[PDB]
Every structure is written in C-alpha cells, then in structure tokens.
C-alpha cells in the first residue's frame, strides 16, 4: 500500500515561504493527513481482527490467557489516537510543536504494548 502510494506521489522537497514573511517553515514534503491515511486504514482493520480473536482466547489456562492485557492494549492505543485528533487539528500553526506530537504519541503507544503484555510476564 505504501509503495504503490509512493510511486504515484513524488518524494522531494516542497518547501514554501509563508505569506507573513517571518519564521519561514522548514523543508516540507507533502501533507501528512491524506498522503499517509492508507497506513491508518490498514492498521485499524487488523486491530478489530485482533480484538475479535482475543474474545475466544479468554477461555485459556491462565498462562495462555492474555485477553485481559490484549483488551487494554487495544483500548489504550485507540484512546490515545482518538484523543490525538484535536491535538493535531488545533496546534497547526507552529510546525516545531506539531511535529513534537508525532514523537510523543508514538512513544506512548510503544510503551503501552510493552507495559501491558511483557511486564506481567517479566514480573514472574
């Protein structure tokens, strides 16, 4: 999906000058909303499959039963991204701050996956 979109689009520098003639933006390629939505759609589809498949793993002998931790991961991550829409669509003036949102939500999503699943196993 990404390669096909990349072929259709063009990777390059599309830096533009702001009309305010002050604090010119950095080297920007393209919009991060529509040119990259394809990855989001594919990931969401398999998240439901993972949640649906976790509905049958509950009846497992404890050690093989991780549906409680999977459900929290499938919910905490969704809440982070559901609440991320106002953040990206509000702080859209200063680019240095909007990009900071990219590096914090992604780190939080990775910590949730490791914390919810690996930490309980590492505790024993």
């Amino acid at each position: 999906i990404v390669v096909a979109w990349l072929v259709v689009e063009a990777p390059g520098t599309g830096k533009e000058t702001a009309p305010e003639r002050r604090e010119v933006v950095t080297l920007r390629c393209n919009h991060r909303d529509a040119s990259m939505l394809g990855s989001l759609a594919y990931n969401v589809l398999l998240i439901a499959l993972c949640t649906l498949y976790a509905f049958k793993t509950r009846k497992c002998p404890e050690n093989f039963n991780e549906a409680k931790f999977i459900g929290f991961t499938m919910y905490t991550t969704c809440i982070i991204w559901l609440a991320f829409l106002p953040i990206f669509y509000v702080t859209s003036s200063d680019y240095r701050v909007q990009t900071t949102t990219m590096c914090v939500s992604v780190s939080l999503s990775g910590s949730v996956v490791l914390g919810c699943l690996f930490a309980p196993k590492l505790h024993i």
Binding site: Y75, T76, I79, I80, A83, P86, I87, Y89, V90, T91, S92, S93
Partner: peptide, 17 residues
C-alpha cells in the same frame, strides 16, 4: 484512561483553535 488522556486536551487547545 479517558480522563488522564483528557489532561492534554484541556491544556492543548487554548492557544490557536
């Protein structure tokens, strides 16, 4: 989880929107 993720919503939008 809902309310803890609501903290950056309140202190994240009183600037531009």
């Amino acid at each position: 989880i809902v309310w803890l993720a609501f903290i950056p919503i309140f202190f994240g939008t009183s600037q531009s929107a």
